[PDB]
């Protein structure tokens, strides 16, 4: 104690957390219009960013 | 709460007398993006 | 060790509340958190 | 809020009853409560983004309510009741609360009305902690200035 | 290597499964017994790790027979079977041979005998618990005994077992007298147990019972004066409160 | 992996049992026999081994009943047991039901026997493959028994050591011998042709052949010596 | 750690607790469902989630809630195999008690004989412990509403309300706050229906997810009877919540 | 090694299990039988103690098996419990069958056989109990045996089993005599016990005693477990207290 | 002890005489012989008392499990469970049991089990030592699918004849109506039926 | 995963699984494709039986069996392990006929089977069964089709699949359910049953197959089980060939 005193746990992005992660990424690369993000998140259940 | 509060004012922690608290262990499965969060915390403070 | 950690959480919460001193509410909340002894038998409650 | 088709489907519902708005507006003079309930059917649903469907209707309605010297009491009870019961997404029901501040702050319909009314708004959103915790600032400044 | 049969002895002697069973016992709740000259008081504390769980549902003080109750320290599941097997042997061996409940001394041997079998076989584990059994009979007086998962029994004036044993034991050593009332013995009991926990000590969560003198109240039938009521009596919370207030 | 091969009650990750696969390997390690059949007859032809040339052979053909019989390939201990049990089933059928036990049902009971020891601790997969023939009401049938217990109806099959040369041969003539009917002799002939190609570094002798025939109007009979010297 | 004796429930650890018996408490989150039961003032309601991940399954055979005997329910968490075996045993026990002792078997006597049976499975090495938490519900002939949770170790303890599953802790805290503020140990609602409504409200809150009439299965104990509700009776209760 | 079953042998023809089971008996308290030609005295030391242990109303290593033969106990008490009960049944079974009490030699033989059986047969522990037998039967008079946990027996005129076996035996044979006396025998157990034990108090609370005599009455045989207050009384006389 | 079970359009009504006889002494005046084994299946007992009693409880245990495990039991189903016990204990027990029950899909069904054991679907059954005097009355006056009131009258008359002509029949006239509406008890006193 | 915990079928792993029981499922994967199509008036079973040597007699080896006389079963996995499971299912059904004198309810059947798998995961000298068994029929309560997994777990199904080609098999099965809300008429569900197995035989392209389809129908078999044979089976073959090209 006095070096590390607090522990902050990081878990996974949630069912509506996973949603946000798509949005940053699609913008970053090139795309022709995509909108299927409501389905894609269910397929991608339990994924890391 | 851990970092930002005592940095602006060490002044409140000093009134109470309890030490301003430091040391955070970040953990979780890889790809969590906790190194990305390292940036976001210090982005608010504009900290180096 | 358990006593040093109760006063530790007592001063931390105080700062969150934006009060300058501890202060019976800060002592009481922090008391009940980290009493220690029996805190992993919640799901192994065949133990008693 | 999952899928884009169910939000649209509530906007259809909202739109048909906006034609009938002059009929709703007539029943508000008879008694204010009667006029609220027909709109409450579409906003109170399990699904979210329903006061963003129904945004077009309550934008006009809260001006009549505000402007009167009695109807703004039933207006405040309505704003608190949406918060607690549903409170839909972070922007939905939260919009109606926010629109009350704009119209209220500029109008000053009476001084007695304005002074109490602001207290009522701030009350609920101390409790809240999302998007109207940012809007909390807006109405706390306005109130503190009067005092 | 000698640890993990029941069949393997160490070079130094003893069997490991018995040794490891004793470890198990000491993890359980703090329970204690004091022999008096007109009673025996037997006491334990209880928990459930969730307040939602009711505390009468559990019973950690159980009358074995009307004149002999018991407690434990150790694993919960093992107690409940072993008490069923004990009541059931109590009838077989002795409530058809005397036509009523057996003396205390007898029944200690019979329960100790089920332990001896749960060591004797291999591929059958010992029981996880150590009992205190206290009861009263008409020839040896009031009495107290410890029955270990070893299949050995030891007579005791006072003893404690479980987590708070080592501390409870030294407090008992000092404070015990050779002649105490039933009433004084209860006060030494509540107090001893209050060493183990404070601030969550109340009569609700403390189960404390006695084997005292006959009660005509729980006999349930009247007009036959040539049989004695239950020597065992369970005390309630509110009654424990009278004694805890009176301290 | 190869460490789950210790016992039969334990599975491997990909899911096998190494013991059943091993019992299977044993069939190959033993004797060779070639089975084939026709709509009117069933014939087994098998190579008998001898330890040395002061040995006078060990028969591989077990008459089950006067309408059923089998050959063996692999462990001789294993075989003695399964045959004895099968003989019990035919007598049972006769006794209680008055019926020549059908070849189709029979293999399935054989399969049931097999699986008892595969499930259980103790026992062992039976170390032998058997080719069972019979002629019932539904004509000839020829069954292929496995250590797993799977029973497989064929026109012609062969098992045992280096038996694939009979299988390549039978495949070539398949439909040819199916047409051969009403002529027991010719099916014996074809069968000798099939087990010749399988052999290599040995050729046939009078006492290496045991030819086992049951057909339409003939019982099960095991032929030996001077009844296999028309087909030497 | 390891060495022997996570391979045996008849051989102790140097801890004094059997490691494989502890694994049955880690085998209870396997199907990822959560249960809630609460007590009324003459009924017991128990609700556990239904997962039908594919349209191939029929939501009428997907259940975890069982009729054990006329007056007795059970909801199971953890795998289907030990669920059936436990349920069977219970069905057989309930049935037996009656011919021996006469009347309907109390929730408590059933729970206790199943707990004693779980402890035996751990006693012997030739039988493993079960892999389920059993939460039994009945309204008793003389003790009225009763919930007894029997864990796969052979521990059994009663409840005012209980929850089980992997998201349990969240329902458990939700319930602590509720029963503490009212200052009672019961729900004071006097029909079975408004007690089913309250239970729906509370599982929605705790987990934080709206559920559908194809994702709930609800069994209701009243005095003298037990029933499992179909999807269309379950909707009545839902539409009651959805506009009050 | 060749620990792993009890139905194995070793490269040297020892069996580790028989040796290990034997060392178990030197973990439990001293037990002494001294035969004299005017009685046999059994004396034993306890292996447990404390001011709240009751041991002043009870015996737990002197059991009368039947009415003319008794044993002192050394070894595990759990192991001991079952075999004492079996031994008492067979001694007394003889009683029923033949309507005269069992001879000493037969009863020790029987119980040794039962012992041996647990090593010989099955997948069970040997029994780690060494019983000192003291009997009277009119065939050989006074008889002293002890049985090994290996499961065999040899007669004795003095023996000591239980803790500190080697030390006790040396002590006993320095001061023993063949003529002897029963009263000199009591004093001898008390003599040996002072030295052997690791408790320097050596008071009544640690001590068990029974003397079996045929000089007690005449034509009659008396087994007397002494009571705790007699055990105290004799400690003054030998001067240890 | 005449017991009977008669079909009608909406169900089946089981009828009984509650006399219980150990020789010329009446052992108990009033004992219904109609003993429920399930909610909507009930049974009638005649012959040796003790034997039928023993058997009955054994049937309730089978049907407690049938409900529990495999969903609703049937009358057909139930009567088979009688037939099994009686037939295997044909040398130790003598039980004359009429099993009848009301289905919602087959309507009322009556299966009699005679003393050796068989199953016999029939519109009507009479069994016991009191039924052997009313055989003549029952066939002639019966017609299928009466209405309940008319049904009651026929049953009532037959069991009342049976007391007049059999001395081991007597006590109150019990009936248990097994209908969709529930289960209804009916009871009748001698003042009423001796006349009718 | 880790070492140990596999070996013995009653050792629980630190993961809350029993590895031995999983390892069985993997053995079932290798077996030949089977499906069941439930209907609103029947059940259909179809199966992929590979012919692996052409000296085999055609239409003569089957993994279709009847149980009692009203319930169809078909298994995947290891064949003789699958024969024993249907075999205990015949003893149970048969016992049932003496005691209760009625055909088995299909859910009643499922309960009994589910217990047997659970017992051979319950000891240390028995072996966990390495088979699935799709089975069902039509009884008093209309049509029901169940699938029993080698874990000792079962459920009702509107469509069940097991085997190698089981992923392809589920894709077509779902489609059937959506275009047909009634749950598809039984007759046409035979022709459909052929086509789905033809598409699954393209993940097993190397070996020939023989198509065996059997059914149980209230309407067109009088509530009895019987195999589909002759011209009827021919139509199902011809339809399937058509729609795959
Ligand atoms: N919360 C998030 N929002 C957007 N991108 C994210 C988020 N979380 C994870 N990512 C993505 O994952 C990548 C890897 O995370 P990084 O910070 O390198 O992780 P770790 O140390 O946990 O491996 C990120 O650079 C980013 O692209
Ligand atoms: Mg990093």
Structure tokens that stand for C46 in this block: 């065949």
CA distance F108 to chain J (A): 8
The rounded distance, in Å, linking the Cα atoms of I29 and I22 is: 11
Residues with Cβ within 8 Å of I154's Cβ and at least 6 positions away in sequence, in order, are I6, I141, I142, I146
Could you tell me which residues are beta bridge partners of residue J71?
Answer: J67, J137
- Residue among E9, E150, E169 minimizing CB distance to H128: E9
Verify whether residue I20 is a known catalytic residue: no
The rounded distance, in Å, linking the Cα atoms of D6 and D94 is: 20
Cα–Cα nearest to J36, from J164, J215, J212, J211 = J215
The rounded distance, in Å, linking the Cα atoms of F194 and F47 is: 12
The CATH number covering residue I55 comes to 3.60.20.10
Residue J104 touches partner F, C-beta closer than 8 Å: no
Query: Do the chains contact at E76 and C41, CB–CB below 8 Å?
Result: no
The minimum-distance atom of ligand 1 relative to the CA of A20 is 3
Structure tokens that stand for F163 in this block: 């038996």
Query: Range of I29's domain?
Result: 1-196
Q: Would you give the DSSP letter of residue E179?
A: S
Across the E:H interface, residue pairs with CB atoms under 8 Å apart total 90
Compare all CA atoms of chain I with the CA of G73 and give the residue at the minimum distance. I68
Residue with tokens 């993940």: J203
The rounded distance, in Å, linking the Cα atoms of F72 and F61 is: 7
- Residues in chain G with CB shorter than 8 Å from the CB of J14 are 6, 23, 26
Handedness of CA H33, H36, H40, H43 (dihedral sign): negative
Residues with Cβ within 8 Å of I170's Cβ and at least 6 positions away in sequence, in order, are I17, I18, I19, I26, I29, I163
The 10 Å Cβ neighbour count of residue F230 is: 12
Q: Tell whether omega for the bond before F2 is within 30 degrees of 0, i.e. cis.
A: yes
Helix (H, G, I), strand (E, B) or coil at I100: strand
The CB of B14 under 6 Å from ligand 1? The reply is no
Report resolution (Å) to 1 decimal: 4.5
Could you tell me which residues are beta bridge partners of residue G225?
Answer: G222
Ligand 1: residue whose CA is nearest its atom 24: B33
Q: Would you give the DSSP letter of residue H127?
A: P
Could you give the C-alpha distances from I158 to A39, I18, I132, J97, in angstroms and in order? 75, 14, 11, 37
At least 3 CB pairs under 8 A between chains J and I: yes
- Ligand nearest to the CA of residue B36, numbered in listed order: 1
Compare all CA atoms of chain D with the CA of G241 and give the residue at the minimum distance. D46
Give the Å distance between the CA of A22 and the centre of ligand 2: 20
Q: Return the H-helix or E-strand segment holding H193.
A: helix H182-196
Residues with Cβ within 8 Å of E88's Cβ and at least 6 positions away in sequence, in order, are none
Q: In what order do the strands lie in the sheet with G44-49?
A: G161-164, G35-39, G44-49, G216-222, G225-228
The 10 Å Cβ neighbour count of residue I33 is: 23
Residues in chain H, overall count: 241
What region, left, alpha or beta, does residue G165 occupy, with left being phi > 0 and alpha being psi -120 to 50 degrees? left
The rounded distance, in Å, linking the Cα atoms of I8 and F41 is: 66
Residue G99 touches partner I, C-beta closer than 8 Å: yes
- Residue among G115, G116, G176 minimizing CB distance to E51: G176
Please indicate if the annotation marks B30 as binding a ligand: yes
**Continuous H helices in G34-188:** 80-101, 107-123, 168-182
Structure tokens that stand for D92 in this block: 């939905």
Residue E26 touches partner C, C-beta closer than 8 Å: no
Please indicate if the annotation marks B46 as binding a ligand: no
Query: Do the chains contact at C45 and G151, CB–CB below 8 Å?
Result: yes
DSSP assignments along J166-183, one per residue: HHHHHHHHHHHHHH-SS-
The rounded distance, in Å, linking the Cα atoms of B12 and C18 is: 8
Compare all CA atoms of chain B with the CA of A21 and give the residue at the minimum distance. B33
SS3 assignment for E202-239: CCCCEEEEEECCCCCCCCCCCCCCCCCCCCEEECCHHH
Q: Taking each helix axis from N to C terminus, what angle separates D55-67 and D72-85, rounded to the nearest 10 degrees?
A: 140
Residue G87 main-chain phi, psi, to 5 deg: -65, -40
Cα–Cα nearest to J13, from G81, G128, G23 = G23
Give the Å distance between the CA of B40 and the centre of ligand 2: 14
The 10 Å Cβ neighbour count of residue H140 is: 12
Please indicate if the annotation marks B44 as binding a ligand: no
- Residues in chain F with CB shorter than 8 Å from the CB of J57 are 153-155
Could you tell me which residues are beta bridge partners of residue J205?
Answer: J207
The 10 Å Cβ neighbour count of residue H165 is: 18
Please indicate if the annotation marks B33 as binding a ligand: yes
The CB of B31 under 6 Å from ligand 1? The reply is yes
Could you tell me which residues are beta bridge partners of residue E144?
Answer: E134
| Residue I104 buriedness (CB in 10 A; 0-12 / 13-18 / 19+) | exposed
Query: Do the chains contact at B32 and A49, CB–CB below 8 Å?
Result: yes
Structure tokens that stand for H61 in this block: 């290593």
Compare all CA atoms of chain E with the CA of H24 and give the residue at the minimum distance. E13
Could you give the C-alpha distances from G22 to C47, G80, G131, G148, J123, in angstroms and in order? 11, 19, 10, 20, 19
Cα–Cα nearest to I127, from I102, I153, I159, I90 = I159
Rg of chain G taking only CA atoms, in angstroms: 18
Please indicate if the annotation marks B31 as binding a ligand: yes
Ligand 1: residue whose CA is nearest its atom 3: A21
Cα–Cα nearest to F130, from F118, F115, F148, F116 = F148
Query: Do the chains contact at I69 and G98, CB–CB below 8 Å?
Result: no
Cα–Cα nearest to F167, from F157, F175, F154, F177 = F157
The rounded distance, in Å, linking the Cα atoms of I25 and I6 is: 30
C-beta separation of F47 from F195 below 8 A: yes
At least 3 CB pairs under 8 A between chains J and A: no
Widest pairwise Cα distance in chain I: 49
Could you give the C-alpha distances from D83 to D34, D128, E124, in angstroms and in order? 20, 9, 61
Residue C18 touches partner B, C-beta closer than 8 Å: yes
The CB of B33 under 6 Å from ligand 1? The reply is yes
C-beta separation of I113 from I96 below 8 A: yes
| Residue E86 buriedness (CB in 10 A; 0-12 / 13-18 / 19+) | buried
Give the Å distance between the CA of B34 and the centre of ligand 1: 7
Structure tokens that stand for F83 in this block: 């045959």
The 10 Å Cβ neighbour count of residue D49 is: 21
The CB of B46 under 6 Å from ligand 1? The reply is no
The rounded distance, in Å, linking the Cα atoms of E206 and E190 is: 8
Give the Å distance between the CA of A47 and the centre of ligand 1: 11
Residue I100 main-chain phi, psi, to 5 deg: -150, 150
The rounded distance, in Å, linking the Cα atoms of I99 and F155 is: 58
The rounded distance, in Å, linking the Cα atoms of J30 and J38 is: 24
Query: Do the chains contact at G155 and C46, CB–CB below 8 Å?
Result: yes
Q: Would you give the DSSP letter of residue C34?
A: T
The rounded distance, in Å, linking the Cα atoms of J229 and J237 is: 11
Count the alpha carbons within 13 Å of F146 in the hemisphere toward its beta carbon. Answer: 17
The rounded distance, in Å, linking the Cα atoms of J96 and J93 is: 5
CA distance A13 to chain B (A): 8
The rounded distance, in Å, linking the Cα atoms of A20 and B36 is: 15
Could you give the C-alpha distances from H7 to E16, H17, H54, H115, H116, in angstroms and in order? 20, 9, 41, 14, 11
Number of domains observed in the structure of chain I: 1
Count the alpha carbons within 13 Å of I163 in the hemisphere toward its beta carbon. Answer: 22
C-beta separation of E119 from H121 below 8 A: no
End-to-end CA, chain J: 43
Solved with:
cryo-EM
The rounded distance, in Å, linking the Cα atoms of E148 and G85 is: 34
Cα–Cα nearest to D93, from D66, D142, D65, D128 = D128
Residues in chain E, overall count: 247
The 10 Å Cβ neighbour count of residue E235 is: 19
In Å, how far from its chain's centre is CA I184?
15
Q: Return the H-helix or E-strand segment holding E131.
A: strand E129-137
Residues in chain C, overall count: 48
The 10 Å Cβ neighbour count of residue I159 is: 25
Name where chain B breaks: residue before each gap, C-N > 2.5 Å: none
Residue B29 touches partner A, C-beta closer than 8 Å: yes
C-beta separation of H72 from H33 below 8 A: yes
The rounded distance, in Å, linking the Cα atoms of E163 and E31 is: 9
Structure tokens that stand for H132 in this block: 């000192």
Structure tokens that stand for F162 in this block: 């280096």
C-beta separation of J160 from J166 below 8 A: no
DSSP assignments along chain J, one per residue: --SSSSSSSSPPPTTSS-HHHHHHHHHHHHSPPEEEEE-SSEEEEEEEEEE-STTBPSS---SEEEETTTEEEEEEESHHHHHHHHHHHHHHHHHHHHHH-SPPPHHHHHHHHHHHHHHTTSSSSS----EEEEEEEEETTEEEEEEE-TTS-EEEBSEEEESTTHHHHHHHHHHHHHH-SS---TTHHHHHHHHHHHHHTTSSBTBEEEEEEEEEESSSSTTEEEEE-THHHHHHHHHHHHHH-
Residue G170 touches partner C, C-beta closer than 8 Å: no
Residue A37 main-chain phi, psi, to 5 deg: -75, -20
Torsion of CA I165, I170, I174, I175, to 10 degrees: -10
The rounded distance, in Å, linking the Cα atoms of J58 and F155 is: 10
Give the Å distance between the CA of B24 and the centre of ligand 2: 14
Which site among A3, A4, A5 would you substitute to test the B interface, given the most B Cβ atoms closer than 10 Å to its Cβ? A5
Could you tell me which residues are beta bridge partners of residue I43?
Answer: I35, I99
- Residues in chain D with CB shorter than 8 Å from the CB of A35 are 4
Give the Å distance between the CA of B34 and the centre of ligand 2: 6
At least 3 CB pairs under 8 A between chains H and E: yes
Residue J10 main-chain phi, psi, to 5 deg: -140, 5
The rounded distance, in Å, linking the Cα atoms of E141 and E139 is: 6
Could you tell me which residues are beta bridge partners of residue H41?
Answer: H34, H211
The CB of A24 under 6 Å from ligand 1? The reply is yes
Catalytic residues of J: 32
Bridge-based pairing of strands I95-102 and F68-74 is unpaired
Q: Return the H-helix or E-strand segment holding F152.
A: strand F152-153
């Amino acid at each position: 104690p006095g070096r590390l005193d607090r522990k902050v746990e990081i878990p996974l992005p949630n069912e509506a957390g996973r949603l946000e992660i798509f949005k940053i990424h699609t913008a970053k690369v090139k795309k022709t219009g995509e909108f299927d993000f409501e389905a894609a998140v269910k397929m991608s259940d339990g994924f890391n960013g | 709460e851990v970092i930002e509060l005592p940095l602006k004012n060490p002044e409140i922690f000093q009134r109470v007398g309890i030490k301003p608290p430091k040391g955070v262990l970040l953990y979780g499965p890889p790809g969590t993006g906790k190194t990305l969060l390292a940036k976001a915390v210090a982005a608010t403070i504009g900290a180096n | 060790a358990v006593i040093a950690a109760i006063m530790q959480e007592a001063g931390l919460r105080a700062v969150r509340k934006n009060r300058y001193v501890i202060l019976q509410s800060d002592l009481e909340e922090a008391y009940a958190t980290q009493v220690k002894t029996d805190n992993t038998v919640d799901k192994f409650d065949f133990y008693k | 809020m999952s899928r884009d088709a169910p939000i649209k489907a509530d906007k259809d519902y909202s739109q048909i009853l906006k034609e009938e708005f002059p009929k709703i507006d007539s029943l508000a003079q008879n008694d204010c409560n009667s006029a609220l309930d027909q709109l409450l059917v579409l906003e109170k649903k399990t699904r979210q983004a329903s006061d963003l469907a129904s945004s077009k209707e309550v934008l006009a309605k809260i001006v009549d309510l505000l402007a009167s010297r009695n109807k703004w009491d039933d207006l405040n009870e309505q704003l608190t009741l949406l918060s607690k019961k549903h409170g839909q997404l972070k922007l939905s029901i939260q919009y109606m609360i926010q629109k009350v501040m704009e119209y209220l702050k500029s109008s000053k319909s009476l001084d007695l009305n304005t002074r109490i009314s602001v207290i009522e708004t701030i009350r609920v959103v101390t409790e809240n902690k999302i998007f109207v915790e940012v809007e909390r600032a807006r109405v706390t400044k306005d109130l503190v200035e009067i005092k | 290597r000698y640890s993990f049969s029941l069949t393997t002895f160490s070079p130094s002697g003893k069997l490991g499964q018995i040794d490891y069973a004793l470890t198990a016992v000491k993890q359980g709740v703090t329970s204690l017994g004091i022999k008096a000259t007109n009673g025996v008081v037997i006491a334990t504390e209880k928990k459930s790790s969730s307040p939602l769980a009711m505390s009468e549902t559990l019973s950690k003080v159980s009358l074995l027979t009307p004149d002999i109750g018991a407690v434990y320290s150790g694993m919960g599941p093992d107690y409940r079977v072993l008490v069923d097997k004990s009541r059931k042997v109590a009838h077989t061996s002795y409530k058809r041979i005397y036509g009523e409940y057996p003396p205390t001394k007898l029944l200690v041997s019979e329960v100790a005998k089920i332990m001896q079998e749960a060591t004797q076989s291999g591929g059958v584990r010992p029981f996880g618990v150590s009992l205190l059994i206290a009861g009263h009979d008409e020839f040896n007086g009031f009495s107290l005994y410890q029955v270990d998962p070893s299949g050995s029994y030891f007579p005791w004036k006072a003893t404690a077992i479980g987590k708070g044993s080592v501390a409870a034991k030294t407090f008992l050593e000092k404070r015990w007298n050779d002649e105490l009332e039933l009433e004084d013995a209860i006060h030494i009991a509540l107090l001893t147990l209050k060493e183990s926990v404070e601030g969550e000590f109340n009569g609700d969560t403390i189960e404390l019972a006695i084997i005292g003198d006959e009660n005509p109240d729980l006999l349930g039938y009247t007009g036959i004066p040539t049989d004695k009521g239950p020597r065992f009596r369970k005390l309630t919370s509110q009654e424990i409160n009278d004694r805890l207030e009176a301290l | 992996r190869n460490n789950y091969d210790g016992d039969t009650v334990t599975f491997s990750p990909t899911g096998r049992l190494f013991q059943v696969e091993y019992a299977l390997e044993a069939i190959k390690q033993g004797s060779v026999t070639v089975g084939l059949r026709s709509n009117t007859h069933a014939v087994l032809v098998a190579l008998k081994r001898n330890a040395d040339e002061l040995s006078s052979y060990q028969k591989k053909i077990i008459k089950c009943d006067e309408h059923m019989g089998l050959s063996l390939a692999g462990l001789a201990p294993d075989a003695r047991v399964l045959s004895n049990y099968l003989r019990q089933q035919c007598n049972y059928s006769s006794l209680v039901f008055n019926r020549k036990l059908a070849v189709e049902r029979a293999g399935h009971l054989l399969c049931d026997k097999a699986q008892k020891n595969t499930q259980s601790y103790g026992g062992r997969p039976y170390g032998v493959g058997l080719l069972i023939i019979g002629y019932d009401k539904s004509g000839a049938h020829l069954l292929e028994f496995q250590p797993s217990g799977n029973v497989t109806e064929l026109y012609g099959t062969a098992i045992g050591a280096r038996s694939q040369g009979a299988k390549t041969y039978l495949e070539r003539t398949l439909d040819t011998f199916i047409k051969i009917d009403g002529n027991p002799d010719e099916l014996i002939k074809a069968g000798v042709e099939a087990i010749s190609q399988s052999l290599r570094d040995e050729s046939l002798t009078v006492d290496n052949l045991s030819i086992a025939i049951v057909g339409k109007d003939t019982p099960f009979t095991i032929y030996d010596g001077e009844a296999v010297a028309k087909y030497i | 750690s390891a060495a022997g004796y996570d391979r045996h429930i008849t051989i102790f650890s140097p801890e004094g607790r059997l490691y494989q018996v502890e694994y049955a408490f880690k085998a209870t989150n396997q199907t990822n469902i959560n249960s809630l039961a609460v007590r009324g003032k003459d009924c017991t309601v128990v609700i556990s989630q239904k997962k039908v991940p594919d349209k191939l399954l029929d939501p009428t055979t997907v259940s975890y809630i069982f009729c054990i005997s006329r007056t007795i329910g059970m909801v199971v968490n953890g795998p289907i195999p030990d669920a059936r075996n436990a349920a069977l045993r219970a069905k057989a026990e309930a049935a037996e008690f009656r011919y021996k002792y006469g009347y309907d078997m109390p929730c408590d006597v059933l729970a206790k004989r199943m707990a004693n049976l779980s402890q035996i499975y751990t006693q012997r090495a030739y039988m493993r412990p079960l892999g389920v938490i059993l939460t039994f519900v009945s309204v008793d002939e003389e003790l009225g509403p009763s919930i007894y949770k029997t864990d796969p170790a052979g521990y059994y303890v009663g409840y005012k309300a209980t929850a089980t599953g992997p998201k349990q802790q969240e329902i458990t805290t939700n319930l602590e706050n509720h029963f503490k503020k009212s200052k009672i140990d019961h729900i004071n609602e006097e029909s079975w229906e408004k007690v089913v409504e309250f239970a729906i409200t509370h599982m929605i809150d705790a987990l934080g997810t709206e559920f559908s009439k194809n994702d709930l299965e609800v069994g209701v104990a009243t005095k003298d009877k037990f029933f499992t509700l179909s999807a269309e009776n379950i909707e009545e209760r839902l539409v009651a919540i959805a506009e009050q | 090694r060749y620990d792993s079953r009890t139905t194995i042998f070793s490269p040297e023809g020892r069996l580790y299990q028989v040796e290990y089971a034997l060392e178990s008996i030197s973990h439990a308290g001293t037990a002494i039988g001294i035969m004299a030609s005017d009685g046999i005295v059994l004396a034993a030391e306890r292996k447990v103690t404390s001011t709240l242990l009751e041991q002043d109303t009870s015996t737990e290593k002197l059991y009368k098996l039947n009415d003319k033969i008794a044993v002192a106990v050394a070894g595990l008490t759990a192991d001991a419990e079952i075999l004492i009960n079996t031994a008492r049944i067979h001694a007394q079974n003889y009683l029923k069958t033949y309507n005269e009490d069992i001879p000493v030699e037969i009863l020790v033989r029987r119980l040794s056989d039962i012992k041996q059986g647990y090593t010989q047969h099955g997948g069970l522990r040997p029994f780690g109990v060494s019983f000192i037998y003291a009997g009277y039967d009119d065939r050989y008079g006074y008889q002293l045996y002890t049985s090994n946990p290996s499961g065999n027996y040899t007669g004795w005129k003095a023996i000591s089993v239980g803790a500190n076996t080697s030390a006790a035996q040396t002590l006993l044979q320095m001061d023993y005599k063949d003529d002897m006396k029963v009263d000199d025998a009591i004093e001898l157990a008390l003599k040996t016990l002072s030295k052997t034990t690791d408790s320097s108090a050596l008071t009544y609370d640690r001590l068990e005693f029974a003397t079996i005599r045929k000089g007690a009455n005449d034509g009659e045989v008396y087994q007397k477990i002494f009571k705790p207050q007699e055990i105290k009384d004799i400690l003054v006389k030998t001067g240890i207290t | 002890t005449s017991i009977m079970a008669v079909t009608f359009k909406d169900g089946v009504i089981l009828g009984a005489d509650s006399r219980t006889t150990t020789g010329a002494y009446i052992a108990n005046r009033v004992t219904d012989k109609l003993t429920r084994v399930h909610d909507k299946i009930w049974c009638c007992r005649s012959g040796s008392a003790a034997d039928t009693q023993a058997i009955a409880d054994i049937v309730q245990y089978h049907l407690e499990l049938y409900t529990s495990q495999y969903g609703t039991p049937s009358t057909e189903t139930a009567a088979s469970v009688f037939k099994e016990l009686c037939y295997e204990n044909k040398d130790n027990l003598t039980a004359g049991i009429i099993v009848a029950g009301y289905d919602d899909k087959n309507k009322g069904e009556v299966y009699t089990i005679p003393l050796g054991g068989s199953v016999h679907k029939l519109p009507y059954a009479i069994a016991g030592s009191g039924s052997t005097f009313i055989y003549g009355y029952c066939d002639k006056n019966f017609r299928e699918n009466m209405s309940k009131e008319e049904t009651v009258d026929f049953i009532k008359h037959s069991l009342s004849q049976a007391i007049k002509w059999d001395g081991s029949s007597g006590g109150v006239i019990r009936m248990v109506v097994l209908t969709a509406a529930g289960v209804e008890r009916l009871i009748f006193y001698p003042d009423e039926y001796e006349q009718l | 995963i880790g070492t140990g915990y596999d070996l013995s079928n009653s050792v629980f792993s630190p993961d809350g699984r029993n590895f031995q029981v999983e390892y069985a499922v993997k053995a079932v994967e290798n077996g030949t494709t089977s499906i069941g199509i439930k209907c609103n008036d029947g059940v259909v079973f179809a199966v992929e039986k590979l012919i692996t040597s052409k000296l085999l007699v055609p239409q003569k080896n089957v993994k279709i069996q009847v149980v009692d006389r009203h319930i169809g079963c078909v298994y995947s996995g290891l064949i003789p392990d699958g024969r024993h499971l249907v075999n205990r299912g015949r003893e149970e059904a048969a016992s049932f006929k003496k005691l209760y004198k009625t055909p088995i309810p299909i859910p009643a059947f499922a309960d009994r089977l589910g217990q047997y798998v659970q017992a051979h995961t319950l000891y240390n000298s028995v072996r966990p069964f390495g088979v699935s068994t799709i089975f069902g029929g039509v009884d008093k309560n209309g049509a029901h089709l169940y699938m029993l997994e080698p874990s000792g777990s079962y459920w009702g199904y509107k469509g069940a699949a097991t085997g190698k080609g089981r992923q392809s098999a589920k894709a077509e099965l779902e489609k059937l359910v959506d275009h047909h809300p009634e749950g598809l008429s039984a007759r046409e569900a035979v022709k459909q049953a052929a086509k789905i197995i033809y598409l699954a035989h393209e993940d097993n392209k190397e070996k020939d197959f023989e198509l065996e389809i059997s059914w149980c129908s209230l309407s067109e078999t009088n509530g009895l089980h019987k195999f589909v044979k002759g011209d009827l089976l021919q139509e199902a073959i011809d339809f399937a060939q058509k729609e795959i090209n």
